[PDB]
């Protein structure tokens, strides 16, 4: 019954100050430890600091000088604050639960683009056969989420009741903007009678798009 959710800005200007918030369920911050671990885009995990059960805090020497952890029982949170970023503090930052030395649960997951620019909502256009595919059980659809940045998006298909045959490829970088293109397979039966729909989200642009993804007519 242990959670561990982490909130924080999606974008931070360099120079600035990053500040996330671990918000624990299922236990007591005075009877456990929590710490911050990051995955610097293009690197392996790195432990940053640890926030003891008795208030003491320890920092990764290297990351110490500018990173500082603390907590607030009453509301049940452990906080970061890292002043004087770089571009190469970018990536997803996680907070964890800690036992005899390592971490049993925790880690629901959290990302985190630090360049000097801003956001930019995603642009969702469907993907469908130009007549082509018809009677084969089995037809693949898709749903090109384009032009968004800092970083992820996350589509689900049909309110995630699909799942197999779902296939969201990574995304590459344009004239400074990210775009992907996720797809879905599915028997012809479901994709008449019954409707298949993608269902986009870009939480640093409170975007919550949903494009049904009907058959082409021409």
């Amino acid at each position: 019954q242990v959670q561990l959710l982490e909130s924080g800005p999606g974008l931070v200007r360099p120079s600035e100050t990053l500040s996330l918030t671990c918000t624990v369920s299922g236990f007591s911050l005075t009877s456990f430890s929590v710490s911050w671990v990051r995955h610097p885009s293009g690197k392996g995990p790195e432990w940053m600091g640890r926030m003891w059960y008795d208030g003491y805090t320890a920092y990764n020497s290297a990351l110490k000088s500018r990173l500082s952890i603390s907590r607030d029982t009453s509301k049940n949170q452990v906080f970061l604050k890292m002043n004087s970023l770089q571009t190469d503090d970018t990536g997803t930052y996680y907070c964890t639960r800690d036992l005899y030395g390592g971490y049993p649960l925790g880690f629901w997951y959290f990302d985190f683009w630090g360049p000097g620019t801003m956001v930019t909502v995603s642009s969702v256009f469907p993907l469908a056969p130009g007549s082509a595919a018809q009677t084969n059980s089995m037809v693949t659809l898709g749903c090109l989420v384009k032009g968004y940045f800092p970083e992820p998006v996350t589509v689900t298909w049909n309110s995630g009741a699909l799942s197999s045959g779902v296939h969201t490829f990574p995304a590459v970088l344009q004239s400074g903007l990210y775009t992907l293109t996720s797809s879905v397979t599915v028997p012809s039966s479901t994709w008449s009678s019954q409707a298949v729909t993608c269902n986009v989200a870009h939480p640093a642009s409170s975007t919550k798009v949903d494009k049904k993804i009907v058959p082409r007519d021409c």
Binding site: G102, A132, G142, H167, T168
Partner: protein, 211 residues
């Protein structure tokens, strides 16, 4: 602190195959070592901990082993949903991870389909066509975006996704995108594929006002 080293950086075997992964500290780590698995865009998973001790969910093909400095994670029966990156974490001295070690299986076979712009996507000065290219085996392929005859080479950009948890294949989606304009300057739109798991390629097409 201790630096952890994770010898084959990348190692690939096949379902069934019993694999063995390494990690070795620069100072006796006695026996506090932990193996965390990561699996792309998920949070790492504790497989075993202080040296050889299956977490409460990890199956039993997982199994720890070592003595200060040198440790090892073997997977006695590679399944297909084990491709991931495994990191070893050392907390005897000071709380450091390892470069990690990729792990790919091995297998073989493709599958394709093309998609022109959206009424919408078009309606705003742009057309982006995009050939998909699902659950194919030898990760390497290679595409070719034509156009009546024409073969525009760029203005495209693709990805491939990771090895499946389930059916050890890759996938690869790419687009080619234009102006709305010359889009709206042709009827013919085609994409040849080309794998291995055919000599003759593969190519699907698509004609302007047709769908």
């Amino acid at each position: 602190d201790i630096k952890l080293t994770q010898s084959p950086s990348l190692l690939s075997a096949s379902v069934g195959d019993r694999v063995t992964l390494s990690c070795k500290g620069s100072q006796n780590i006695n026996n506090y070592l932990a193996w965390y698995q990561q699996k792309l865009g998920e949070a790492p998973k504790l497989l075993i901990y202080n040296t050889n001790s299956l977490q409460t969910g990890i199956p039993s093909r997982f199994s720890g082993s070592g003595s200060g400095t040198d440790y090892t994670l073997t997977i006695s029966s590679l399944q297909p949903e084990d491709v991931a990156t495994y990191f070893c974490y050392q907390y005897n001295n000071g709380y450091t991870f390892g470069a990690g070690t990729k792990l790919e299986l091995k297998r073989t076979a493709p599958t394709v389909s093309i998609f022109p712009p959206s009424t919408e996507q078009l309606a705003t000065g742009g057309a982006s066509v995009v050939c998909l290219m699902n659950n194919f085996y030898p990760r390497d392929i290679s595409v070719k975006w034509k156009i009546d005859g024409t073969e525009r080479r760029d203005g495209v950009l693709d990805s491939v996704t990771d090895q499946d948890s389930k059916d050890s294949t890759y996938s690869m989606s790419s687009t080619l995108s234009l102006t709305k304009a010359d889009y709206e300057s042709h009827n013919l739109y085609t994409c040849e594929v080309v794998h291995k798991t055919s000599s003759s390629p593969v190519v699907k097409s698509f004609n302007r006002n047709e769908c």
